[PDB]
Design a binder for this molecule. Sequence first.
Ligand SMILES: O=C(NCCCNc1nc(Nc2cccc(CN3CCOCC3)c2)ncc1C1CC1)C1CCC1
Ligand SMILES: O=C(NCCCNc1nc(Nc2cccc(CN3CCOCC3)c2)ncc1C1CC1)C1CCC1
Lengths: 619, 619
Amino acid sequence: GSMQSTSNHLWLLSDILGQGATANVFRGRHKKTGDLFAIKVFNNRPVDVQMREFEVLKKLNHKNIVKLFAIEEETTTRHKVLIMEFCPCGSLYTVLEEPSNAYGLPESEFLIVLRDVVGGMNHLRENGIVHRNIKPGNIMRVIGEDGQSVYKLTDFGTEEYLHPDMYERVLRKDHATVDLWSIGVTFYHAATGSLPFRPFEGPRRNKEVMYKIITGKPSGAISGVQKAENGPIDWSGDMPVSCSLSRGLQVLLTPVLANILEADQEKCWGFDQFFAETSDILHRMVIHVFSLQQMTAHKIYIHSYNTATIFHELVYKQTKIISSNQELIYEGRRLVLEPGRLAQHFPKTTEENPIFVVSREPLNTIGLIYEKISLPKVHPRYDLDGDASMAKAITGVVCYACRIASTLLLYQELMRKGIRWLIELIKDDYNETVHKKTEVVITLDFCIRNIEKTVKVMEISDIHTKLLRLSSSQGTIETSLQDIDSRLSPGGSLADAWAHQEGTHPKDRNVEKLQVLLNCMTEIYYQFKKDKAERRLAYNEEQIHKFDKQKLYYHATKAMTHFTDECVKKYEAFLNKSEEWIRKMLHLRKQLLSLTNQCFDIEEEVSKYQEYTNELQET
Amino acid sequence: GSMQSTSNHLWLLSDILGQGATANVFRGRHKKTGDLFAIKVFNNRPVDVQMREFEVLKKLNHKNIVKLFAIEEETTTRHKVLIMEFCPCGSLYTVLEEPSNAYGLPESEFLIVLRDVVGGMNHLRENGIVHRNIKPGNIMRVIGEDGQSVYKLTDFGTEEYLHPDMYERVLRKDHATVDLWSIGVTFYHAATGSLPFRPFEGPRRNKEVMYKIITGKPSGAISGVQKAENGPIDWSGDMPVSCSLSRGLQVLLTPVLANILEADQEKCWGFDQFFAETSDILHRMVIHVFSLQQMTAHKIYIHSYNTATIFHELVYKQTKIISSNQELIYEGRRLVLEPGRLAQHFPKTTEENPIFVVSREPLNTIGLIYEKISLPKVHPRYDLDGDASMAKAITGVVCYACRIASTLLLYQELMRKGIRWLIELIKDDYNETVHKKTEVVITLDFCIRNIEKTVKVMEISDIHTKLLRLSSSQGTIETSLQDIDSRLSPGGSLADAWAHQEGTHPKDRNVEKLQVLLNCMTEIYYQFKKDKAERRLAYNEEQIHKFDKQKLYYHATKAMTHFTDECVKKYEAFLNKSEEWIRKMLHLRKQLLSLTNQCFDIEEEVSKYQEYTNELQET
Ligand SMILES: O=C(NCCCNc1nc(Nc2cccc(CN3CCOCC3)c2)ncc1C1CC1)C1CCC1
Ligand SMILES: O=C(NCCCNc1nc(Nc2cccc(CN3CCOCC3)c2)ncc1C1CC1)C1CCC1
């Protein structure tokens, strides 16, 4: 294949990375080093209006802006080319096309996108530039030297991302907020895998319905979807259930989207507010909490300099457990946080190693709430464009099922761990009061006798009668403690055994079994992606394509069956069993507490007769 | 490209999987389904001597034997082809060629290899078959439905793997043990990434030196390496330091290899013993233990039905901490194992969540012992065969550095966790004795007074003088406890802070930084693998190959520098700091114990004068 060139670079025309009305982008090399670069070639002012604007871009130095290195002349034409930083990974679009991102980015990746888009935007503004159309295709991805994605803006200076005024397309007036809109759509797309505003069929098919959805949108709504043809619009101010972002993050993100997806730019946020509100999210650290009675994991987004008081409030918001009722467990022991303890001084947590919260007050066992998504039907009609689109969708469904399977397993593993720890904690309490009791018996049983000690050496009868009631009261405690110990023992009604008998375990390798099926589906999907780009298949490759179409469905059905019949069913049995075990536990702790307070009441009444034994003497 | 065929199958001649003197193996498809199969075509008794042997193989049904499905006639020739199970992953050879396996398989994979080879071998024997030459190329890998490798034997009925009698090449006499030899070599290769018997240069280059090494091999040795030309042989009965297998596994594997790599078949093990000894390994479960004072992780290979007594003995073997001195910690709390408790009833562990062992007796802080491996020099001479070989080696070195970096980080993370837990445990002890003390003060300070109580109501002077010494003795305890509490406090000499200040942390992302560099090296390695197979490169591809040769070295140097300067240096500082913190801790626990025993001594002497207060009375 032929290639163009300049003094320092050359590039195959086959290795094209991007195509715009203004220019083409190819992947090329430095002739002398061999290093990869993106070559931007313009097809066609006044002459120096661009040479100037080329210069300003060369000056821009920021982590979140794709770098413009040099401006050279192509060899065959004297036309200007731009040598720009090559981004091997591609764009946010590339990422969002992965079947595993069909329902939104993983939370960690979403946060990098949020951070980098925001930092890039701000840098432009800081230099006076406006990037009229941000979109996943504009947002380039590179692997940072620490293995983390870095997102970088390029091509500054589409329908689904255009503002309602921009979607109409008068010069966009003249002076921005319009940029916040495509940012809003972009962030929603990244969070959910879908566009927020969706006419039935496609936006392009119904340009008019799309405009109606966006202008007639009620304030606060962040999405509007038409599910049937010519049907009404389902509005929402919330993220879809299928979104993977934590409730903690959803609660912060939602208001931002709502306030930058606002039609009347009168009430749009403006950049500075947007920058403040997004930075406030980005600057928060995350503390992982697991609600043991609700069977729910939580991410608490809290500032380094925030107190435990604020932490408790944030936990109440997600659990509805008031601060005073929040009992914390971490790495096998109670965690007691002083009110003014800064979050940066909290113990380190992960999703696998969270702080557990428990309450002495009854709570509904919730578990994981997720979307029930079935396989789309597979259209038997051979079609390279349709099949690749379908392959993506059905693989996307199985990926989601796999992510849920993983979360379900995690929830069960955390449950088992928290329960194990809580039982040991309760046992400490049982042992703490049992010492306290035996400790007061030793003085009570001693002082009850010390009275008669003097008699052998007229009212005392009134002292013995009230006291012998205490020993009798202590007999009632003994038998009740023996009953609690009995329940905490291996055969006890608060036994652990069921937790190892119910649900699913790592050794079951359910996640891995599903991943294997997913991997088969993903290979076929990518091949279909190849088959689409190649317009026609030869007879053999055609049949093989049709065979694997059936194989896709076969793999998907097998996965879903395993997921529902094995993963979900056993999870729901474990959950139902947990719910009863929780109920018993609360009842036991409540009875134990009562026995403990009785031990304190008895102890102090005995600490009163200890002195009343000795009278004043004549001397 | 042309393809051969049969009624049911067809295959490109380009898609060849394997080549033997007897037959070729291609990757083909069922014509009607499209399903992949291995087609084995024979090039050439008597006629039915093979039709019979083909039939016996068709009957063989085992997980660890590659399946023979059918025997069909090719279309152009009436020649017999075998349709066999296609193994998408390839062979153990394929696996061992990966740069990340240059120093042996990961322990988990090695165990699957051990299991599957053994199960396959046994199945053959159970049917009377002998597989004269097992080798990594004979051992096929498939992904099991649970995502785990399954290894399968094929091609039954090389130099480095041949027995000394076989290496000579008289009909191999007639009747096996000879098979155990290539099994021995294979397992050693899998464990270490290298052949056990290595003349200088290559075995093929020095067929004579190789035979000398193997026959003149002293008993017990499992390897023999000639490091210089015409130089002596370094024998070893142990695994190389660079081996990744745990000491626990190494201790069991080594004797097996030594006894099946035995020259004189007089003293070779024989199959049944081999099957017993290997099964005994495969049937053991693993308990992860971390020695906190030695800074060493351990895998304890123990039977389900073994007792804690046996467990302690196994731990002593790897740590040299006698049973009685072994103090166990798990998930933040002491673990007390009853002597007869079966290992299957132990708490579940992983490398990340081990049982910690500590001792009140001094131990040398060891840390991780690993091989210091430097980069090979890169030969500037362009050579497709040499460069691909070199690329593999240098990438192999960086992978090893990456695995070590990971283990070093883990060791530090475990240290930090164990220390954190131990400090809380010591604090419990401090609080347990402090209650005990105040508890006896309340009776001592009471009974010291109860004496004078009677006087106000001739020898007592002898009672007060011994007793006032006890209160004085209790004053000496109080001040000593206040000194221990002081050390356990945030400013205390047993502070935790250094552990968060020294070494490296997950947030440093050192492992990930190295992985990125490794990924760049691995892409180039695979391209070189492609460049080798293609005999010559065009001018451009040639230069690019030479450029990336320099890039390989650049990436490797950067990685090693980061590893030594950042990972290793900070690890060694953390280790040195740990060593002193351990020393203090032992001293503190020793002083605390002493204060605790004094609290018991005082307590019982006071529990004697409690009754001696009251005399017999006339009545
Ligand atoms: O830049 C634009 N649009 C989208 C981005 C095309 N640009 C790039 N793509 C890339 N990389 C890239 C683009 C698309 C796909 C991929 C992934 N491919 C996988 C297969 O092997 C080739 C890379 C990589 N790097 C840099 C750039 C230019 C300098 C900013 C403007 C619209 C036409 C110009
Ligand atoms: O079987 C023999 N030698 C080595 C194994 C060749 N056989 C196979 N290879 C495979 N798979 C395989 C072999 C080599 C490489 C690979 C990996 N390739 C990666 C690139 O895409 C094609 C597969 C896969 N499957 C089955 C078989 C035969 C039925 C037992 C005997 C020696 C010649 C016959």
